[model samples]
Target: LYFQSSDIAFLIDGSGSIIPHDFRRMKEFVSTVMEQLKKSKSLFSLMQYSEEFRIHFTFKEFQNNPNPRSLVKPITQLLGRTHTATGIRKVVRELFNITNGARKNAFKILVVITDGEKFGDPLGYEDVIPEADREGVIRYVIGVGDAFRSEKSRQELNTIASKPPRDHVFQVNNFEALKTIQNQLREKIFAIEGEP
Candidate 1:
């Protein structure tokens, strides 16, 4: 199997809105994806955010441990406000840094999983997204729940995602539906690695 080296960061929502059960489902979804891509020439880091952000693991940690299940098992929710933009800025700045185990030449990808809500975020998408673009990070946003049904909410996803929003944006009615998009998300990341 040919796998291009890549650095992938998962920015997840761990707000109070997500119930314990749904949060577990989100973790399971992340675990499943990590397991499937573990064999690839890719490094992963997981960061959870509510009003605050925390890095559960780094690319270096994943390289050393490489155990998806256990890595995700200890992840707990922060349970506060959404602050999605703040979290994105943090990931773009901190999680993708060389000191954080990010590869110099690997393709940088950011996977943002959220419920399409922004609350009490000191920063806006415009404030941080350009930095991500300047850093050459490919972004994909998986928006869960009906919150995205509104035009305003959906637009936020589009702005957060890379150009041609259709390809980089995914919406599921509920957390359980996350399982259904696993293969599709994996394939999109594979396509990136497959590219020259």
Candidate 2:
């Protein structure tokens, strides 16, 4: 454990579009991420969204887990479409209420992997851009598929991943990129000067 366990929020989409099969892929992705993060002594918070939001695990539960699969096992049960704004607001506003104490002087990450359908409504994109700006929580969006390839979709993804003019968004063309993205995140986590 090079670093310490930190709080992470997994804001997944569970609307009409997301099915159980696809969700399992997402769960595996998280599992891979946790496997790597364990090397850094980091843990996470898991949150998923459909029409609403569910926080499956907090810092306490995540920190107690010795196996990453133990963490991913629960993700299989989550299924929803995708509601960027509603979902983001729920996790950001509410979870902060609980995890704020832990977030202090620690890495806070928001990983949103989707194909760019906001609860099957792409127009709600505005809410996400503004919210990401206000929160200063670095967001990493995995496009999952070719769904968000349009120019407008790219703009929206940038807003969520990056912020303001120089948004720090990581763009991926497919779900397979999860491995690369997780590695990238790990680099960012380990590079940061923790609790100096």
Candidate 3:
């Protein structure tokens, strides 16, 4: 709720790699995040991606629903390939625009949750990511599951996250472990917005 003015988006991997069992855990993560940030005066959008990306809801739909779970429940049905870079491209170009309910004065943030095991290089065409950051987009990447256990994978996440990596990149051993970092993430997410 501290963030009285902000625009936020969640880009999730609904790929074939993420089975229904794990998808439920991912949804729980979304619900918890929504519950925490719901008190704020921020506009929100949600996207699920595999071979293609789908916008489950934009800021308007979120604001209209008294309960966010209504929006999240349907997301449980999504599944496909892990075209993550394609999803990021959409977030930077389309999701954060005024046409998509992004407020001109609001701080823009994109939170990406992925398994980090894409079929190909999701960062192959990720130039738009840093481009958007230069235009004032703050990004956070949460790398979930065993895929991110290696140092190489960690570095991969570091590249995609907003710099300085330590502050914006998060890793959890598995989806269930994601809850443990929720409070810490909440703090870091709004950390940069604080008065100096």
Q: Write model 2 residue lDDT over 18-111, tens digit each, in one string.
A: 5567667778888777677664545577677765667777666766665767866765444445667776676667654454334565566677
The lowest-lDDT stretch of 10 consecutive residues in candidate 1 is: 34-43
What TM-score do all the candidates reach, one by one?
0.97, 0.78, 0.90
Clashing pairs in 2: 14-80, 14-81, 15-80, 15-81, 82-119, 162-167, 162-168, 162-169, 163-167
Q: Against the unseen true structure, what C-alpha lDDT does each candidate score?
A: 0.91, 0.64, 0.77
* Top candidate, metric TM-score: 1
Q: How many backbone clashes does every candidate have?
A: 0, 9, 1
User: What is the descending TM-score order?
Assistant: 1, 3, 2
Position 63, candidate 2: lDDT: 62
- Residue 125, model 3: lDDT of 37
Which ranges in model 3 have alpha carbons more than 4 Å from their true place? 121-125, 193-196
Candidate 3 versus the native: TM-score?
Answer: 0.90
Report the C-alpha lDDT of model 3 over 1-196, residue by residue, as the tens digit.
Answer: 2445777789998887777888898888887787776645766788998887789887766667736677787675456667777787888777877776777777788888998666653555355666767668787889998889988878867867888989888898888888988898777756744444
Ranking by lDDT: 1, 3, 2
| Residue 127 local lDDT, model 1 | 93
Clashes of 2: 9
Candidate 3 deviation (Cα RMSD): 2.2
